[PDB]
Amino acid sequence: ACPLEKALDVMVSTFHKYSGKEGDKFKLNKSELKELLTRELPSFLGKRTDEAAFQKLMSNLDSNRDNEVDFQEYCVFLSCIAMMCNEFFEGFP
Amino acid sequence: ACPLEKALDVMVSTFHKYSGKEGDKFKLNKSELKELLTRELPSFLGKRTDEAAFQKLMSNLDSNRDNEVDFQEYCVFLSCIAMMCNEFFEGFPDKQP
Numbered sequence: 689a690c691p692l693e694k695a696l697d698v699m700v701s702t703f704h705k706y707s708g709k710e711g712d713k714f715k716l717n718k719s720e721l722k723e724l725l726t727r728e729l730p731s732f733l734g735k736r737t738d739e740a741a742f743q744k745l746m747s748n749l750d751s752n753r754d755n756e757v758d759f760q761e762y763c764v765f766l767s768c769i770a771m772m773c774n775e776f777f778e779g780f781p
Numbered sequence: 782a783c784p785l786e787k788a789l790d791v792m793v794s795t796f797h798k799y800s801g802k803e804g805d806k807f808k809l810n811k812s813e814l815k816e817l818l819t820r821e822l823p824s825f826l827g828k829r830t831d832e833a834a835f836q837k838l839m840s841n842l843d844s845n846r847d848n849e850v851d852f853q854e855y856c857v858f859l860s861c862i863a864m865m866c867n868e869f870f871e872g873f874p875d876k877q878p
């Protein structure tokens with residue numbers, strides 16, 4: 689009935705699907721971020737699944753510099769992706 | 782299938798579903814925000830669909846003070862809802878205290 693509320697639930701559940709695998713269950717480490725990105729957001733990195741790309745992404749996302757991505761930082765990341773899609777919604781910039 | 786990519790697509794399209802109804806097609810005015818909230822996010826305001834609630838929400842979301850909610854401000858809003866949902870992922874507050 690409410691696709692946007694369902695979308696939010698997917699955002700929440702997908703985080704935990706990977707954040708709970710290793711160490712802090714509420715934060716994504718490098719390995720968990722790698723798996724989330726490759727499996728759940730393959731269109732984002734595309735062919736850039738190398739270690740250099742993942743280190744750059746980690747540094748971009750880890751705003752509080754604790755070496756992991758928490759839920760707030762993850763939401764900022766997803767917001768950035770949405771904003772990029774927003775820029776091309778009309779079929780031109 | 783990639784549910785998270787589908788979720789992002791819905792997040793983007795739902796904005797434009799309402800933002801393009803009046804005036805600036807890339808921003809939600811009060812009227813458009815009301816429609817979006819009531820129809821797409823009824824759980825957020827719940828029973829608080831009065832004018833006082835909607836002015837409060839607009840003030841809370843309109844960070845740049847241009848009287849409307851742009852895409853960036855909308856993302857901040859959805860992020861806050863996601864964080865609130867995150868607190869009850871287990872069906873109780875497992876991150877509290």
Ligand SMILES: [Ca+2]
Pocket residue numbers: 706707708709710711712713714715716717720
């Ligand atoms: Ca973890």
Ligand SMILES: [Ca+2]
Pocket residue numbers: 749750751752753754755756757758761
């Ligand atoms: Ca961090």
Ligand SMILES: [Ca+2]
Pocket residue numbers: 799800801802803804805806807808809810813
């Ligand atoms: Ca508008």
Ligand SMILES: [Ca+2]
Pocket residue numbers: 842843844845846847848849850851854
């Ligand atoms: Ca604004």
